[PDB]
Amino acid sequence: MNELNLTVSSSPHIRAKHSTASIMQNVIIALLPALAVAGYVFGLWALALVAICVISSVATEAVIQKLLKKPITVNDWSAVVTGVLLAFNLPINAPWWIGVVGSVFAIAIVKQCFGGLGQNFINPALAARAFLLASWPGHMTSTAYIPLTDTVTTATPLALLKAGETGSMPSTLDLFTGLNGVYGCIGEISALALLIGGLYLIYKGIISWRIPTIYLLTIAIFALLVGQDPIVHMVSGGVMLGAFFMATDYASSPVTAKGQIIYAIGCGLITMIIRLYGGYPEGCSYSILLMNVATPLIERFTKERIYGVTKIKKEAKA
């Protein structure tokens, strides 16, 4: 009298192997070499800060998921990505509580007030960075980036570039590798490591060539049209990390190819404008945020044609 007790559902009955956790772990694997370079250059305090941020992010998320009566989905490795990318945007002379405050702002307000993962329209890490720069400008400006053991440098390359002191700037090979006196954010100095990680992410099928290629091309053309050096503008600042890792966020980018092209062109234009005629030495974060704001307008004009229909000339509702 044995029964069967089968399962009934809807089609399909097979799935693919990839999931969210695999994608996030691959992003962490891609970000590892920049962490190695930062630890080699800046020392043991560069790693510890990173750890602090990660811990804070995870803790914050769990607490909210316990109070709102929701399943605790902390094993998809997304808060880890947010914490690492936030820690990469800090100087070496920052206190321990700045990372805690930034992580709490990034997780509690930007992400979890809108629904959770994928339900927001803005970048958490860049918004937290802008909030930190506005609230505490003395801990985030132009002196916190130079190590206390060095007393000859006294300026980062973008500040010297904007002031016309080109002769005291580091070499272009040094700016490409980041190994002979290049200072800035801990996870931005080396462009070779970020390029390697971005190529690995492109090979795996997680991102595409469009956004980084068009970003860098627009920056180079803008620099060439006004009589400047394109390579120096590309290998200095935080434009490689933004191009390969931060402008390619899933929740704040268009889903079509044409929208992505327009998005990248606008990002490059606003970045170069703020760099040349603005009140900041860099304009990557604000350009990406401003293109995040304009994304829902781009998406309604750049959708593909549907199989079947052959266009209606705005006369079906008259």
């Binding site: 307000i109 909030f131 506005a134 609230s135 505490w136 400008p137």
Partner: protein, 196 residues
């Protein structure tokens, strides 16, 4: 039995700041201290009382096609007299709130209450309505100003709390730091209203 209900609608049931969400520009502009909000609320309440009584005393001869010019004429006269007196006797408050004292004539609460309650009621009810709305406006402004000032300056009513080594959150006293704060407050009220 009817005066008290109109007086107490006011602060809680129909708060202009927390329920109707009106008069947002001075609310988000001047609430960087606990002193500015009180003075703004008091001046607005005086103007509201005068305008409501004056408009309700003339709801028999004003035609429906020229009502807005008459309303704004009365409100502007009251605002001008109040501003002249405040310039004569209180220069510090006038200097602190320089541009929004001439802008009391356009406050989204005086004109809204003029065409919703004063145009169809008597003198006794309009006075109570104006008093209640002014009290609610003043209370909300004082609460928001205190909350913003404590975080963004480290002091309450000019009295320091955390010492001389405190480093304030300078975004709270900035235009982006008002919006978020107010939103959170309203959410809290909702969580204590439908759940209770």
């Amino acid at each position: 039995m009817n005066f008290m209900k109109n007086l107490t609608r006011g602060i809680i049931r129909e708060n202009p700041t927390f329920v109707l969400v009106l008069g947002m520009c001075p609310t988000l502009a001047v609430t960087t201290s606990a002193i500015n909000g009180m003075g703004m609320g008091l001046a607005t309440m005086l103007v509201l009382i005068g305008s409501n009584v004056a408009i309700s005393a003339l709801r028999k001869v004003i035609p429906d096609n020229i009502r807005i010019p008459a309303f704004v004429v009365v409100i502007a006269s009251f605002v001008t007299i109040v501003g002249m007196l405040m310039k004569a006797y209180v220069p510090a408050l006038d200097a602190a709130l320089g541009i929004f004292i001439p802008l009391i004539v356009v406050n989204c609460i005086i004109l809204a209450r003029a065409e919703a309650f004063a145009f169809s009621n008597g003198i006794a009810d309009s006075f109570a309505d104006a008093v209640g709305m002014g009290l609610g406006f003043t209370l909300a402004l004082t609460i928001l100003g205190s909350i913003r000032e404590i975080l963004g300056a480290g002091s309450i009513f000019g009295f320091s709390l955390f010492g001389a080594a405190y480093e304030p959150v300078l975004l709270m006293i900035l235009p982006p730091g008002a919006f978020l704060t107010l939103g959170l407050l309203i959410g809290l009220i909702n969580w204590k209203t439908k759940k209770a």
